[PDB]
Design an enzyme around this catalytic site. Structure first.
Site, mmCIF file in Angstrom:
data_model
loop_
_atom_site.group_PDB
_atom_site.id
_atom_site.type_symbol
_atom_site.label_atom_id
_atom_site.label_comp_id
_atom_site.label_asym_id
_atom_site.label_seq_id
_atom_site.Cartn_x
_atom_site.Cartn_y
_atom_site.Cartn_z
ATOM 1 N N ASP A 233 -24.379 110.479 -9.106
ATOM 2 C CA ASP A 233 -23.115 111.199 -9.063
ATOM 3 C C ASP A 233 -21.989 110.199 -8.799
ATOM 4 O O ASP A 233 -22.176 108.987 -8.927
ATOM 5 C CB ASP A 233 -23.182 112.347 -8.053
ATOM 6 C CG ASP A 233 -23.592 111.904 -6.660
ATOM 7 O OD1 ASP A 233 -23.741 110.694 -6.407
ATOM 8 O OD2 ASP A 233 -23.779 112.792 -5.805
HETATM 9 C C1 LIG Z 1 -16.796 105.536 10.832
HETATM 10 C C2 LIG Z 1 -17.457 106.748 10.180
HETATM 11 C C3 LIG Z 1 -16.482 107.922 10.166
HETATM 12 C C4 LIG Z 1 -16.729 108.769 8.922
HETATM 13 C C5 LIG Z 1 -15.922 110.059 9.008
HETATM 14 C C6 LIG Z 1 -15.571 110.548 7.609
HETATM 15 C C7 LIG Z 1 -16.578 111.588 7.146
HETATM 16 C C8 LIG Z 1 -15.921 112.502 6.113
HETATM 17 C C9 LIG Z 1 -16.952 113.487 5.577
HETATM 18 C C10 LIG Z 1 -16.276 114.818 5.279
HETATM 19 C C11 LIG Z 1 -15.557 114.741 3.938
HETATM 20 C C12 LIG Z 1 -16.268 115.653 2.941
HETATM 21 O O1 LIG Z 1 -17.407 115.910 3.102
HETATM 22 S S1 LIG Z 1 -15.394 116.346 1.512
HETATM 23 C C13 LIG Z 1 -16.303 117.792 0.903
HETATM 24 C C14 LIG Z 1 -17.196 117.389 -0.265
HETATM 25 N N1 LIG Z 1 -17.693 118.583 -0.923
HETATM 26 C C15 LIG Z 1 -16.889 119.231 -1.934
HETATM 27 O O2 LIG Z 1 -15.836 118.784 -2.224
HETATM 28 C C16 LIG Z 1 -17.393 120.493 -2.635
HETATM 29 C C17 LIG Z 1 -17.763 120.189 -4.084
HETATM 30 N N2 LIG Z 1 -18.901 119.296 -4.084
HETATM 31 C C18 LIG Z 1 -18.730 117.873 -4.315
HETATM 32 O O3 LIG Z 1 -17.632 117.445 -4.480
HETATM 33 C C19 LIG Z 1 -19.940 116.939 -4.288
HETATM 34 O O4 LIG Z 1 -19.531 115.670 -3.865
HETATM 35 C C20 LIG Z 1 -20.640 116.804 -5.644
HETATM 36 C C21 LIG Z 1 -21.315 118.110 -6.051
HETATM 37 C C22 LIG Z 1 -21.717 115.726 -5.493
HETATM 38 C C23 LIG Z 1 -19.638 116.396 -6.720
HETATM 39 O O5 LIG Z 1 -20.202 115.491 -7.611
HETATM 40 P P1 LIG Z 1 -19.421 114.061 -7.820
HETATM 41 O O6 LIG Z 1 -19.459 113.280 -6.533
HETATM 42 O O7 LIG Z 1 -20.116 113.293 -8.914
HETATM 43 O O8 LIG Z 1 -17.978 114.299 -8.188
#
Ligand SMILES: CCCCCCCCCCCC(=O)SCCNC(=O)CCNC(=O)[C@H](O)C(C)(C)COP(=O)(O)O
Ligand SMILES: CCCCCCCCCCCCCCCCCC(=O)OC[C@H](COP(=O)([O-])OCC(O)COP(=O)([O-])OC[C@@H](COC(=O)CCCCCCCCCCCCCCCCC)OC(=O)CCCCCCCCCCCCCCCCC)OC(=O)CCCCCCCCCCCCCCCCC
Ligand SMILES: CCCCCCCCCCCCCCCCCC(=O)OC[C@H](COP(=O)([O-])OCC(O)COP(=O)([O-])OC[C@@H](COC(=O)CCCCCCCCCCCCCCCCC)OC(=O)CCCCCCCCCCCCCCCCC)OC(=O)CCCCCCCCCCCCCCCCC
Ligand SMILES: CCCCCCCCCCCCCCCCCC(=O)OC[C@H](COP(=O)([O-])OCC(O)COP(=O)([O-])OC[C@@H](COC(=O)CCCCCCCCCCCCCCCCC)OC(=O)CCCCCCCCCCCCCCCCC)OC(=O)CCCCCCCCCCCCCCCCC
Ligand SMILES: CCCCCCCCCCCCCCCCCC(=O)OC[C@H](COP(=O)([O-])OCC(O)COP(=O)([O-])OC[C@@H](COC(=O)CCCCCCCCCCCCCCCCC)OC(=O)CCCCCCCCCCCCCCCCC)OC(=O)CCCCCCCCCCCCCCCCC
Ligand SMILES: C/C=C/C(=O)SCCNC(=O)CCNC(=O)[C@@H](O)C(C)(C)COP(=O)(O)OP(=O)(O)OC[C@H]1O[C@@H](n2cnc3c(N)ncnc32)[C@H](O)[C@@H]1OP(=O)(O)O
Ligand SMILES: CCCCCCCCCCCCCCCCCC(=O)O[C@@H](COC(=O)CCCCCCCCCCCCCCC)COP(=O)(O)OCC[N+](C)(C)C
Ligand SMILES: CCCCCCCCCCCCCCCCCCCC(=O)O[C@H](COC(=O)CCCCCCCCCCCCCC)COP(=O)(O)OCCN
Ligand SMILES: CCCCCCCCCCCCCCCCCCCC(=O)O[C@H](COC(=O)CCCCCCCCCCCCCC)COP(=O)(O)OCCN
Lengths: 228, 85, 253, 312, 84, 83, 193, 157
Positions: free
Chosen positions: E40
């Site tokens: 991905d």
């Molecule tokens: C020092 C350490 C500190 C870290 C803190 C930071 C952590 C931040 C984590 C929170 C941010 C999020 O999760 S953001 C939320 C992410 N989830 C969504 O947006 C819903 C839609 N699903 C997607 O986007 C998926 O990634 C996918 C299906 C694989 C799309 O495939 P691709 O990818 O090919 O595009």
């Protein structure tokens, strides 16, 4: 020509006296605290002599204020130089006949290095934006608008040059013929109803020049009301 | 000093005015009052130089005679002279 | 519509704007800037009194602008080469962009003569070129070095005239090749001839002349009558900027 | 209210013309200046006499021909300009009762060296550029809103023709007239473009959304239909309009509106403002030296070169 | 062409080899990140960051978003004038 | 006619690049060492003005023959990691 | 401009007025003349050209000091100072060629006279070896002064106008100092002594 | 001579991709016979990228440090390293580039654009601080929005 030598000496001495006088007047203005001499107004001259060569204008001829004549220019009786037109005789002289019109923003001149004088005949219509370089034009000829007549070309009497044409260098245009094209070529002969309008054209310009000269006199009196 | 030093100074002033015009893009005859002031200054400068010629000759003969170098009277007129050569 | 007041002009906003129909004498400058775009010219240039040079224009060496010619550098830059002549009432303009993708400035090389009533717009003219009268060289076109364009010729946009040749017509076609003496001497001869004529005009010019005496007489008459207004232009520009800043601040919150 | 609004001397505030002299020294200098002016003008006149006939031509200011009248004619109806009463000096001298001046909208721009005369109407936001000739003397000239007549273009009309028809020149809205174009007794409809150096002759019609190319000669009594490009001498059919050229016409009109604004801003400044601006340019170039001794105490306003505040 | 097309290729394979979600023998010199290798967007970003770590560069978001293949990455590194 | 440039463009340009891949030193060290050499040891030439002219001329030619030019100077020691 | 004129005058006047030493400066004459001439031949930047040509000129002035005869020293120094006043205030580049022909010692201009009394007094007291070195370095100096003439005389003329006032503000001094072609009439006489 | 094509500017156009020192790719169009440094100047690059050609009688030519790929190494013009032009290039490498030099380092005035350069990608190399005179120098940091094209003259003095 030693006459031109005496004229040259006198013109240079008078020019030096004029420079000295204008400089002393500017020093006087600076002492007064008035700086009107520094104004960047338009310094255009309708009549522009080239040293001792002054244009020779008849009392019934008219040059528009945005027009100009320079050097050795002769304007005949009831001949007109209109708005924005430039007639240049500072290198080689220009001779214009009587009842001939140089229309708005037209260029007539003999400034090339090998050009002869320009000779324009009687009752000649030189159209808008036409460029005339070192040519000879006979009597009763219409020079069409935005046309070019080159050096040593002969426009004989009664011929018509159409609009936008270009007559080449040293080209003789015969009498009573219409020529057109950028490699200009004979198109036809002048027709009689055409020749009637050709005969009646320069008198209108004469009366139009009279009306415009009167209006320019009104403008000059309006201007003279301010400072006098 | 030299007899024709003032005329040389006037030619210097004329050339000065012509060059001041040429540097600023003007023709040679423009601003003739600049030529006149330059001519006056050149005349007086070269007359002062011609006066220093006689002054230097007088200083040389005076210093040389005080040191003991006795110059004959036929040669003292080459030095102790306001000669207008 | 666009307002005619500029508060970010380099010398400030205009305190007093004069309507053109209220002018009683012609006040057209021949060399003037447009906001922050100032023309550049040498000490021995000839600019005719009824010619107009405005905006971002660079002039070099012994170049000359003859009677009624316009060099308007408002959309881009214009450069006039050493000993290049712009003859009577020719127009030089420039576009903001050209179809070729190159620089859109009008660049004119040294020793280039442009005959009367010709128009140059966003074109490239290389050194030693004669442009004929009533000729138009359009946007993005290129005229190569040591070439001649016949009078009343059209060079369409993004077209090229090869070097060493004479071209002419509408549209411009091949006429003939220049001779070697023509490339060696004649182009320089034409440029030198027009520079000599410009020098003849430059020698006889009394600048600023004496036409200001009448206008000063009118102003003296106004001071005599007590109707001449003294305006503190620097302070008025300052106060207008402060009012503009206050008006801008009193609308965002 | 810069910092010294109540202590600046009058010469600094009014560089174009100093106020009236008060003391003995200033009056002595003023009298010396008047004497110098008299002697200088006398030497100028004497030099012109010694010079010859060329000295009789004198330096005179030129009339404002950007807004100029023509004769009111009885056979010519006034439909573009306006009939205004004549001046009383003209009436008492050379028999004028009514003249015709142009009808100029307040947002239009006219160049100071253009020639717009008589029976001419100028629409809102329109522009006439440097060296253009618009002579409405025997008929009418109409220029629409947001239209531009560019540099060294010639506009003229006919009353008497070859075929005996009096024709005005009508120019529509959003029309661009190219550099050194010739417009003579013809009709240009809305949103058209006439190429630079082109010629349109008597009684020719350019329909809306068409382009006359550069260098083209339009023959008399020719109708150029909509969405076509014509070129050549004489002009024949060349192409249909591209999708982009129609928007390019409007882009050209908007660009000249924006340009006419800046040019009108620069042109309509007075002499006193221009002289004050030259003094400001001089002070700004003197302040561009970083070793200038005032830079350690005073902070200067960028646009006027006045002391704004104390730096320290 | 600022650098050769062999050593960059084996360096690309060397850094592609140490990925836990990739197959150490399925990796080919001309493959795809999406259909072939099954990655991905975040896995692609991680691989591009590994390539950036190995070659000492900086690849912006749009340029790394355009990279979708092993051949695309090799061509981008070869076309880069600041490669190591 | 124009003469051909001798050699190959790649080889010539590598010759042009050679020994310049190094940061240039400031000139303060050369100037200070020159001033120290003159102010400390130029008094050794005081009696040399009275020596025979054949000796002085041969010494001047010897100094010219052993002079190394400061411009375009390079050493192999600049790019080696041990003596 | 300040550094090439005033301190040299001040220090040489102190030397003329109140200094005696029992030594020589001949090796520094040789070093200055050869190093200055070869350096100005080899350095393409114009500032370095004029720095090395200044070192050559101070070597000539040291030859005038070493053979006594401070009159030739003072004449050459005055002509050099006037040339410096012309050099650093030039706006028209055609006069850069006059500085070139008058710093190369070419005959009718004043630099020839300033060099030639130094050569005359050196030959008078028979300082043959230093004189021969000076003549060789004078032959070398002509090449880069000709480079100056090639750069600024055989070129199209362009001189930009002023815009913010002060129009070509030091044309008086530069045009006055170019009249070093008229000073040679006074230089040939017994003038500086 | 016949119905053959009218000459267009598009026949003589050369396109070069240029990567500046921030890594931003640029599309640079030039004409055949024009040098690369001139096309870089006319594109609108800042004046801190350019420096004088340090030869005698050619300091009025502006030049830039470019990185050229191995395919286009043989289309740089040949310079004799024993001639005076070779010593000019040696002076430029000695003083301006110094330890930014790579095996792809050239100078842009020695590249004359032709059809063989069409599609070539080059990069702008870094340079050390330098001075020619008081009115033309470089302090070492590329923080200036002034274009080289907007300078009216190139002054050797
Ligand atoms: C020092 C350490 C500190 C870290 C803190 C930071 C952590 C931040 C984590 C929170 C941010 C999020 O999760 S953001 C939320 C992410 N989830 C969504 O947006 C819903 C839609 N699903 C997607 O986007 C998926 O990634 C996918 C299906 C694989 C799309 O495939 P691709 O990818 O090919 O595009
Ligand atoms: C006869 C006199 C000149 C000969 C000549 O040109 O013949 C004209 C005549 C043809 O005339 P033309 O075709 O109309 O063109 C004439 C020139 O081309 C037109 O040229 P111009 O008028 O533009 O230039 C002036 C004109 C010649 O005009 C002059 O200059 C006349 C001389 C006196 C007037 C100048 C005073 C003002 C100028 C200011 C400059 C210096 C400042 C002075 C102020 C301080 C001094 C107190 O110059 C020449 O043509 C020849 C130049 C050399 C002649 C003399 C100049 C040398 C130095 C002058 C020193 C001035 C100091 C005196 C005080 O030729 C012949 O007759 C054939 C030759 C046979 C005689
Ligand atoms: C009864 C007869 C009437 C008298 C006529 C007098 C001639 C006109 C003078 C015009 C004038 O005073 O103002 C011009 C002009 C100011 O007028 P402007 O054109 O508005 O100013 C231009 C700039 O804006 C300048 O702006 P600014 O106002 O800040 O300028 C101040 C100006 C000073 O002007 C003023 O402030 C007022 C001028 C004096 C007024 C009172 C006098 C009456 O600056 C100067 O000091 C100019 C320096 C130029 C050179 C002066 C001498 C340098 C000597 C150094 C030696 C170099 C040559 C040596 C050769 C080398 C040998 C190795 O002032 C000067 O350039 C003064 C120069 C010298 C004037 C004295 C002339 C005397 C010599 C006799 C003249 C021969 C011709 C006779 C004419 C009649 C037959 C042809
Ligand atoms: C203790 C502490 C240690 C500190 C050491 C300091 C060193 C710092 C480095 C340094 O100075 O930088 C070099 C520095 C480079 O100078 P620069 O200011 O950068 O540039 C100036 C030039 O551009 C120079 O440019 P370049 O160096 O880049 O080279 C360009 C080259 C370019 O050369 C050319 O192209 C011209 C060549 C002309 C002819 C070419 C040959 C063609 C012949 C045809 C072939 C036929 C075969 C003939 C065979 C040969 C016959 C000629 O020029 C030369 O090679 C000629 C320069 C030689 C100067 C000679 C002047 C010395 C006195 C004059 C009498 C001797 C002269 C010879 C004539 C007599 C013969 C009888 O040189 C100096 O400043 C000179 C001073 C250094 C030498 C002595 C060092 C003092 C240390 C004293 C040691 C302990 C005390 C013992 C002595 C007692 C007190 C004196
Ligand atoms: C008790 C002592 C009194 C003061 C004596 C020392 C101060 C001298 C400063 C001076 O003359 O100020 C120039 C000043 C002119 O400056 P400005 O007109 O305001 O500036 C205009 C520009 O500089 C542009 O104008 P410009 O560059 O053409 O003129 C600059 C200025 C001077 O320009 C120069 O520096 C070049 C002149 C070269 C001649 C040098 C003479 C040395 C000859 C050695 C002979 C032994 O022009 C003059 O030649 C004026 C001379 C006035 C009489 C000097 C006595 O002259 C005066 O206003 C008169 C000062 C005389 C005493 C009051
Ligand atoms: C200052 C203000 C500027 C403006 O805003 S517009 C005012 C000035 N603008 C102009 O220059 C308008 C004219 N410009 C154009 O050329 C255009 O509109 C012109 C559109 C029809 C055409 O210009 P193009 O760049 O689109 O050229 P084309 O591809 O249409 O050319 C086709 C054809 O027509 C010929 N052609 C093209 N242009 C012209 C011309 N001009 N004259 C004669 N013949 C031409 C040409 O010969 C061509 O054939 P060949 O060269 O033989 O293959
Ligand atoms: C006879 C010879 C006269 C010499 C010429 C006059 C002096 C030279 C003037 C050159 C032009 C420069 C200029 O502008 O003049 C100065 C030069 O000034 C001087 O030289 C004046 C010095 C004092 C003169 C003597 C005054 C009376 C003393 C006797 C009691 C005056 O400065 P302003 O600011 O314009 O003067 C302010 C006055 N006013 C408001 C009226 C404009
Ligand atoms: C017009 C010029 C352009 C305008 C610009 C002006 C420039 C500023 C002024 C000039 C600057 C250069 C001057 C340099 C110094 C030369 C003079 C030094 C003195 C000198 O030579 O010695 C005296 C001879 O004087 C003399 O008479 C020496 C003659 C002149 C020497 C200069 C030659 C070049 C001109 C003798 O002194 P003494 O025997 O009286 O001393 C005994 C008591 N201690
Ligand atoms: C160097 C410039 C000159 C170029 C050509 C030199 C050729 C060599 C000179 C031949 C002179 C004839 C000759 O041998 O006679 C000598 C006469 O002495 C003398 O008088 C020697 C004078 C020779 C040099 C004169 C040239 C000076 C030109 C200007 C130089 C620059 C300023 C001074 C450094 C000594 O005879 P012998 O020893 O063979 O007899 C043997 C028995 N005893």
């Amino acid at each position: 020509n030693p006459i031109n030598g005496l004229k040259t000496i006198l013109h240079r001495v008078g020019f030096a006296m004029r420079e000295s006088g204008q400089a002393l007047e500017r020093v006087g203005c600076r002492l007064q605290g008035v700086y009107s001499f520094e104004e960047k107004l338009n310094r255009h001259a309708t009549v522009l002599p080239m040293r001792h060569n002054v244009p020779s204008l008849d009392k019934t001829s008219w040059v528009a204020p945005s027009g100009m004549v320079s050097g050795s220019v002769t304007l005949g009786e009831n001949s007109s130089v209109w708005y924005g037109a430039i007639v240049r005789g500072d290198f080689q002289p220009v001779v214009v006949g009587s009842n001939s019109n140089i229309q708005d923003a037209a260029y007539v001149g003999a400034t090339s290095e090998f050009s002869g004088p320009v000779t324009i005949g009687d009752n000649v219509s030189v159209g808008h934006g036409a460029v005339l370089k070192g040519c000879t034009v006979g009597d009763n000829v219409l020079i069409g608008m935005n046309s070019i007549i080159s050096e040593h070309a002969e426009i004989q009497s009664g011929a018509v040059i159409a609009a936008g044409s270009y007559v080449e260098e040293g080209t003789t245009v015969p009498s009573g013929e219409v020529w057109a094209g950028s490699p200009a070529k004979k198109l036809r002969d002048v027709r009689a109803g055409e020749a009637e309008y050709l005969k009646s054209l320069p008198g209108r310009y004469t009366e139009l020049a009279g009306e415009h000269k009167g209006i320019m006199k009104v403008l000059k009196m309006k201007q003279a009301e301010y400072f006098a | 000093g030299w007899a024709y030093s003032g005329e040389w100074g006037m030619l210097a002033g004329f050339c000065f005015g012509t060059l001041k015009n040429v540097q600023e893009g003007k023709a040679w005859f423009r601003r003739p009052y600049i030529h006149g002031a330059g001519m006056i200054a050149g005349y007086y400068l070269f007359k002062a130089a011609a006066d220093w010629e006689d002054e230097a000759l007088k200083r040389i003969i005076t210093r040389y005679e005080r040191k003991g170098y006795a110059i004959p009277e036929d040669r003292k007129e080459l030095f102790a002279a306001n000669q207008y050569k | 519509g666009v307002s005619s007041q500029f508060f970010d002009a380099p010398n400030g906003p205009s305190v007093k704007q004069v309507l053109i129909e209220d002018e009683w004498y012609n006040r057209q400058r021949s060399i003037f800037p447009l906001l922050d775009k100032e023309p550049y010219y040498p000490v021995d240039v000839f600019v005719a009194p009824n010619a107009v040079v405005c905006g971002d224009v660079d002039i070099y060496g012994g170049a000359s602008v003859f009677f009624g010619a316009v060099l308007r550098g408002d959309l881009n830059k214009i450069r006039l080469g050493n000993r290049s002549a712009i003859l009577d009432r020719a127009v030089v303009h420039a576009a903001r962009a050209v179809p070729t993708g190159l620089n859109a400035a009008t660049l004119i090389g040294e020793k280039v003569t442009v005959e009367p009533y010709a128009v140059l717009r966003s074109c490239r003219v290389e050194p030693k070129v004669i442009i004929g009268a009533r000729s138009v060289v359009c946007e993005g076109a290129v005229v190569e070095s040591e070439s001649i364009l016949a009078p009343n010729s059209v060079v369409p946009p993004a077209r090229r005239i090869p070097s060493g040749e004479l071209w002419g017509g509408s549209p411009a076609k091949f006429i003939r090749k220049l001779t070697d003496h023509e490339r060696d001497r004649v182009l320089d001869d034409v440029s030198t001839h027009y520079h000599n004529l410009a020098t003849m005009f430059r020698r006889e010019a009394l600048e600023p002349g004496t036409a200001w005496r009448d206008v000063e007489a009118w102003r003296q008459k106004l001071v005599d009558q007590g109707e001449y207004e003294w305006i503190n232009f620097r302070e008025q520009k300052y106060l207008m900027r402060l009012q503009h800043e206050a008006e801008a601040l009193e609308k965002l919150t | 209210m810069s910092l010294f609004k109540s202590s600046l001397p009058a010469g600094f505030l009014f560089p174009y013309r100093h106020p009236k002299a008060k003391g003995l020294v200033e009056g002595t200098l003023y009298g010396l200046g008047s004497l110098f002016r008299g002697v200088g003008a006398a030497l100028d006149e004497l030099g012109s006499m010694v010079q010859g006939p060329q000295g009789s031509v004198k330096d005179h200011v030129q009339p404002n021909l950007a807004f100029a009248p023509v004769h009111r004619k009885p056979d010519v109806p006034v439909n573009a300009g306006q009939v205004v009463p004549a001046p009383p000096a003209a009436a008492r001298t050379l028999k004028i009762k009514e003249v015709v001046v142009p009808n100029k909208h307040s947002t239009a721009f006219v160049a100071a060296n253009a020639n717009v005369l008589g029976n001419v109407k100028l629409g809102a936001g329109s522009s006439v550029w440097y060296g253009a000739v618009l002579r409405g003397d025997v008929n009418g000239i109409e220029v629409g809103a947001n239209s531009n007549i560019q540099d060294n273009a010639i506009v003229h009309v006919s009353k008497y023709s070859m075929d005996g028809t009096a024709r005005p020149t009508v120019i529509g809205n959003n029309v661009t007239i190219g550099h050194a174009a010739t417009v003579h007794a013809c009709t240009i409809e809305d949103n058209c473009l006439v190429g630079m150096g082109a010629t349109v002759l008597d009684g020719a019609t350019v329909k809306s959304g068409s382009i006359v190319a550069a260098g083209a000669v339009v023959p008399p009594n020719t109708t150029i239909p909509s969405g076509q490009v014509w070129a050549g001498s004489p002009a024949k059919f060349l192409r249909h309009l591209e999708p982009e050229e129609a928007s390019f016409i409007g882009k050209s009109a908007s660009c000249y509106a924006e340009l006419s604004a800046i040019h009108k801003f620069e042109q309509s400044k007075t002499f006193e403002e221009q002289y004050t601006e030259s003094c400001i340019i001089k002070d700004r170039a003197a302040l561009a030296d970083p070793s200038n001794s005032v830079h350690q105490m005073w902070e200067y306003d960028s646009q006027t070169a006045l002391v704004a505040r104390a730096k320290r | 062409g600022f650098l050769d097309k062999d050593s960059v290729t084996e360096r690309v394979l060397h850094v592609t080899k140490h990925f836990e979600k990739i197959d150490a023998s399925k990796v080919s010199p001309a493959a795809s990140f999406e259909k072939d290798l099954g990655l991905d967007s975040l896995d692609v970003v991680e691989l591009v960051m590994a390539l950036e770590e190995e070659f000492g560069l900086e690849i912006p978001d749009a340029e790394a978003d355009k990279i979708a293949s092993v051949g695309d990455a090799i061509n981008y590194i070869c076309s880069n004038p600041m490669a190591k | 006619y124009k003469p051909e440039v001798p050699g190959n463009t790649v080889d010539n340009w590598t010759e042009l690049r050679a020994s310049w891949n190094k940061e240039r030193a400031s000139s303060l060290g050369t100037n200070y060492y020159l001033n120290v050499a003159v102010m400390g040891f130029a008094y050794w030439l005081n009696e040399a003005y009275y020596f025979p002219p054949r000796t002085l001329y041969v010494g001047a030619l010897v100094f010219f023959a052993l002079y190394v030019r400061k411009a375009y100077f390079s050493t192999p020691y600049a790019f080696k990691h041990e003596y | 401009l300040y550094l090439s004129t005033a301190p040299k005058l001040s220090l040489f006047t102190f030397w003329a007025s109140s200094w005696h030493h029992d030594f020589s400066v001949g090796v520094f004459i040789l070093f200055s003349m050869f190093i200055g001439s070869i350096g100005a031949y080899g350095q393409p930047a114009l500032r370095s050209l004029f720095a090395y040509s200044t070192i050559n000129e101070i070597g000539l002035l040291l030859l005038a000091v070493e053979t006594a005869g401070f009159h030739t020293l003072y004449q050459h120094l005055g002509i050099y100072i006037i040339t410096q006043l012309l050099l650093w205030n030039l706006t028209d580049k055609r006069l850069f060629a006059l500085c070139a022909v008058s710093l190369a010692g070419l005959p009718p201009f004043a630099g020839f006279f300033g060099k030639a009394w130094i050569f005359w007094h050196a030959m008078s007291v028979q300082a043959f070896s230093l004189l021969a070195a000076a003549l060789f370095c004078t032959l070398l100096s002509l090449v880069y002064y000709l480079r100056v003439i090639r750069l600024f005389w055989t070129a199209p003329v362009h001189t930009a106008a002023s815009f913010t006032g002060a129009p070509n503000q030091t044309t008086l001094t530069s045009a006055c100092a170019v009249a070093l072609a008229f000073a040679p009439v006074m230089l040939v006489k017994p003038f500086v002594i | 001579h016949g119905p053959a094509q009218t000459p267009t500017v598009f026949d003589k156009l050369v396109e070069v991709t240029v990567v500046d020192m921030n890594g931003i790719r640029h599309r640079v169009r030039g004409l055949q016979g024009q040098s690369l440094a001139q096309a870089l100047v006319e594109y609108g690059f800042p004046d801190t990228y350019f420096f004088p050609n340090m030869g005698f009688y050619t300091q009025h030519i502006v030049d830039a440090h470019v990185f050229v790929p191995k395919e286009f190494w043989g289309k740089v013009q040949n310079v004799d390293p024993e001639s005076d032009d070779g010593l000019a290039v040696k002076r430029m490498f000695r003083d301006i580039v110094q330890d930014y030099q790579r095996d792809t380092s050239f100078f842009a005035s020695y590249i004359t654009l032709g059809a063989e350069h069409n599609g070539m990608t080059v990069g702008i190399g870094p340079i050390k601080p330098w001075i020619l005179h008081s009115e033309w120098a470089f302090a070492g940091v590329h923080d200036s929005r002034n274009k080289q094209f907007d300078k009216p003259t190139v002054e050797i003095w």
